[PDB]
Enzyme design. Structure first.
Site, PDB file in Angstrom:
ATOM      1  N   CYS A  68     -65.923  21.357 -11.341  1.00 57.70           N
ATOM      2  CA  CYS A  68     -66.366  20.154 -10.665  1.00 57.70           C
ATOM      3  C   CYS A  68     -67.819  20.339 -10.202  1.00 57.70           C
ATOM      4  O   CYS A  68     -68.068  21.029  -9.217  1.00 57.70           O
ATOM      5  CB  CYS A  68     -65.399  19.889  -9.503  1.00 57.70           C
ATOM      6  SG  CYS A  68     -65.929  18.679  -8.272  1.00 57.70           S
ATOM      7  N   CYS A 128     -68.583  19.387  -6.674  1.00 57.86           N
ATOM      8  CA  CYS A 128     -68.021  20.390  -5.751  1.00 57.86           C
ATOM      9  C   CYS A 128     -69.002  21.535  -5.550  1.00 57.86           C
ATOM     10  O   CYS A 128     -69.237  21.997  -4.421  1.00 57.86           O
ATOM     11  CB  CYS A 128     -66.688  20.926  -6.251  1.00 57.86           C
ATOM     12  SG  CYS A 128     -65.414  19.659  -6.466  1.00 57.86           S
TER      13      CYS A 128
END
Length: 119
Positions: free
Chosen positions: A39, A42
């Site tokens: 991600c 993230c």
């Protein structure tokens, strides 16, 4: 203050429930960053989250949980469907959350707002 405080991984429900017990004995909230290694948003949020963790050194511990590496029953307990999802837990339960699907600096301000609502 420290430059940065690295987030500690939570591997399963056993670890979460022990963390929650200890944090409630200290009358502290915890932060959980529900994320994934793949991600991008993230990973881009991680440095700013770890700088925010340094601002709270000794007051609130910040943890991370990789949604594709921890048991599904733990992910489902957090009611996680987006990443990163930053949650505040206090008194053994999930109290608040921020979804980090927008600008990182703004997400950090929102996480601080969430912390100040429950610290």
């Amino acid at each position: 203050r420290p430059t940065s405080v690295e987030m500690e991984p939570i591997d399963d429900s056993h670890h979460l429930d022990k963390i929650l017990l200890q944090a409630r004995e200290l009358s502290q909230p915890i932060i959980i960053d529900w994320m994934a290694s793949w991600c991008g948003p993230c990973i881009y949020l991680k440095p700013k989250l770890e700088k925010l963790a340094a601002e709270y050194d000794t007051k609130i511990k910040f943890y991370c949980a990789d949604v594709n590496k921890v048991p599904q029953a733990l992910v489902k307990r957090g009611n996680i469907s987006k990443m990163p999802t930053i949650q505040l837990w206090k008194d053994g339960e999930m109290k608040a959350e921020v979804i980090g699907g927008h600008k990182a600096w703004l997400v950090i301000e929102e996480v601080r707002e969430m912390i100040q609502k429950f610290v």
